[model samples]
Target: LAAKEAKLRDLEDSLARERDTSRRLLAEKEREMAEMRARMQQQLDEYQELLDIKLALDMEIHAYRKLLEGEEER
Candidate 1:
């Protein structure tokens, strides 16, 4: 019985250490994921802004082309 109690305490201590390590690892992973998400969001915003600019430029080009064509038709 004495030996068994000692063994149980040892096992409990090992289990606690494992749990602590797992928790720490999980927290680290969570932080990394959050940072990655922020970066992705920033990239997406930049892409959207670029798309908006491209669309505006295309509209202007189309307008100019139509104006020139009308003058040519004259």
Candidate 2:
């Protein structure tokens, strides 16, 4: 019975170590994913702003073209 109890204690210690390693790994992965998400969001925002500016420029050009065409017709 004493030998069995010793084995049981060893097994429990091993299990605890494994659990701690897994928790630490999970936390590290979570942190990396969070950082990546923030970077992607920032890139997306920059692209959105650039797209808005391009669209505005395109509209301005179109309006000027129409005005020039009207003057030529007159």
Candidate 3:
């Protein structure tokens, strides 16, 4: 009975340790995932900003060409 109780206690301690370790690892992974999402969102926002700028520049360039064409006509 004594040996059996000791073995049970050891197993319980090991299980508790494993549970704690698993929780810690899960928390670390969640943190990493959150950081990655933030980084991706930042990159996506930057890409959108660049796309908007390009569209505005393109419009201005087109307007310039139209003005040049009008001058040539005159």
Candidate 4:
């Protein structure tokens, strides 16, 4: 009975350690994912802004060309 109890205690301790390690690893992974998402969001927003800027610039450039040619027809 004594040996069995000791073995059981050992197993329990091992399980506890494993559980703690797993939780720590999970938290670390979540942090990494959050950082990646933050970087991706910045890139996504920047690209979207660029798209709008280029679109407006294209129209403005066209207007300039038309004005340079004295074409009043819009």
How big is the RMSD of model 3?
1.7
Candidate 4, pairs of clashing residues: none
The TM-score values for the models, in the order shown, are 0.84, 0.78, 0.85, 0.79
Clashing residue pairs in candidate 1, if any?
none
Cand. 4 Cα-lDDT: 0.94
Per model, how many backbone clashes are there?
0, 0, 0, 0
CA RMSD of all predictions: 1.6, 1.9, 1.7, 3.2
> Which pairs, if any, clash in model 2?
none
User: Candidate 3 — what's its lDDT?
Assistant: 0.95
Candidate 3: tens digits of C-alpha lDDT, residues 1-74: 95899898999998999999999999999999999999999999999999999999999999999999989894
Better of 2 and 4 by TM-score: 4
On TM-score, the candidate that comes out on top is 3
Off by over 4 Å in 1: none
> lDDT (CA) for every model shown?
0.95, 0.95, 0.95, 0.94
Candidate 4 Cα RMSD (Å): 3.2
